[PDB]
Curated annotation (Swiss-Prot):
Changing T72A: Partial loss of ubiquitin cleavage in vitro; no effect on ISG15 cleavage in vitro. LRR repeats lie at residues 114-136. Residues 1-54 form the Ubiquitin-like domain. This is Papain-like protease nsp3. It comes from Severe acute respiratory syndrome coronavirus 2. The active site is at C108, H268, D282. It is a multi-pass membrane protein. Changing A142D: In strain: Alpha/B.1.1.7. It catalyses: Thiol-dependent hydrolysis of ester, thioester, amide, peptide and isopeptide bonds formed by the C-terminal Gly of ubiquitin (a 76-residue protein attached to proteins as an intracellular targeting signal). The gene is rep. It is found in: Host endoplasmic reticulum membrane. Responsible for the cleavages located at the N-terminus of the replicase polyprotein. Participates together with nsp4 in the assembly of virally-induced cytoplasmic double-membrane vesicles necessary for viral replication. Antagonizes innate immune induction of type I interferon by blocking the phosphorylation, dimerization and subsequent nuclear translocation of host IRF3. Also prevents host NF-kappa-B signaling. In addition, PL-PRO possesses a deubiquitinating/deISGylating activity and processes both 'Lys-48'- and 'Lys-63'-linked polyubiquitin chains from cellular substrates. Inhibited in vitro by GRL-0617.
């Protein structure tokens, strides 16, 4: 009989003694070591003293699981460990002071989101996401990528959209202070002002240029008449998205952008970031240029407080 530690958060640990003749599942339920399902595995003597992730079976473990992950979904732990088994084996090179991911298992959209998160100000609500966020910015991003897949209900290898992934992530972040007051002017219906908050205040689908959003875009009116322009914006950033089109990216006018080339869904993502010059991060590959023209679908801008003059 070996002694062992079980946990759900790797924070609050539990002393447990396990019989060497019964499998972990027969004593704890679904049990994992570093993402590897050991439910049907008998204890090895090398497993003495190690910490095992277990599915919550009592109320103390259920509460701890929520406090760290902010979910009661019983499938979360298993989807997390299943992804972790792959992401632990990816390569996370430092590219231009940023942690990227070497290409594997169609992870190009994950790497793009990982690079973007290192360049915008964001606080995650679940401690599990926040703690892994910090570890990722220091170069150890395996646990962070697995959580993104789990929180986004995505599996390793599945085809992912960066804008959808960012949106999912924003919903698990503290964006309560974010505000976007908008205005629509129709010839017949009149004028109308809408105030969006949270995730809807920081994302727009339609145009890539923040300037174009400030000037105003064409939207159909409720009576079929209109123009919609940004009045006030109170957020640490904004994300502008449009379907992949050729776009000129000028140094200093944006933070970072998503380049998408190829067919819908089965394509490939590249990350454009604006430093002292334009940089292109394609997994572990890095290229720099003074100007950039190419197929962009997301652009990220910096912000704090903006009030229009119209
Ligand atoms: C790589 C990938 C994986 C998954 C998905 N999702 C989309 C729908 N989602 C509910 C599923 C989970 C699958 C999309 C894609 C994907 O390729 N995304 C690119 C950026 C894309 C978007 C749009 C477009 C037009 N409107 N909106 C709202 C988005 N159009 C494109 C046209 C041509 C080429 C690329 C386009
Ligand atoms: Cl919550
Ligand atoms: Cl890829
Ligand atoms: Cl969710
Ligand atoms: Cl949610
Ligand atoms: Cl949350
Ligand atoms: Cl330049
Ligand atoms: Zn405990
Ligand atoms: Zn929460
Ligand atoms: Zn794999
Ligand atoms: Zn969730
Ligand atoms: Zn109208
Ligand atoms: Zn310049
Ligand atoms: Zn790819």
């Amino acid at each position: 009989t070996i002694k062992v530690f079980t946990t759900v958060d790797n924070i609050n640990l539990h002393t447990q003694v396990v019989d060497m003749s019964m499998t972990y599942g027969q004593q704890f339920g679904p049990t994992y070591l570093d993402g590897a399902d050991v439910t049907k595995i008998k204890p090895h003597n090398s497993h003495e003293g190690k910490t095992f992730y277990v599915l919550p079976n009592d109320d103390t473990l259920r509460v701890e699981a929520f406090e760290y992950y902010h979910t009661t979904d019983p499938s979360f732990l298993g989807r997390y460990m299943s992804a972790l088994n792959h992401t632990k084996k990816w390569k996370y090179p430092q590219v231009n002071g940023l942690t990227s991911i070497k290409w594997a298992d169609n992870n190009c959209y994950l790497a793009t989101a990982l690079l973007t998160l290192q360049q915008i100000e964001l606080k995650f609500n679940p401690p599990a996401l926040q703690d892994a966020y910090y570890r990722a910015r220091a170069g150890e991003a395996a646990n962070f990528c697995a959580l993104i897949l789990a929180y986004c209900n995505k599996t390793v290898g599945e085809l992912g959209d960066v804008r959808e992934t960012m949106s999912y992530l924003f919903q698990h972040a503290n964006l309560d202070s974010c505000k976007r007051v908008l205005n629509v002017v129709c010839k017949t219906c009149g004028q109308q002002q809408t105030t969006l908050k949270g995730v809807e205040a920081v994302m727009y689908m339609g145009t890539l240029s923040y300037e174009q959003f400030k000037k105003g875009v064409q939207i159909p009116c409720t009576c079929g008449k209109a123009t919609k322009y940004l009045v006030q914006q109170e957020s640490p950033f904004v994300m502008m998205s449009a379907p992949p089109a050729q776009y000129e990216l000028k140094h200093g006018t944006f933070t970072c952008a998503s380049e998408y080339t190829g067919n819908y869904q089965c394509g490939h993502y590249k990350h454009i970031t604006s430093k002292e010059t334009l940089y292109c991060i394609d997994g572990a590959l890095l290229t720099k240029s003074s100007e950039y023209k190419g197929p962009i679908t997301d652009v990220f801008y910096k912000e704090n407080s903006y009030t229009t003059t119209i």
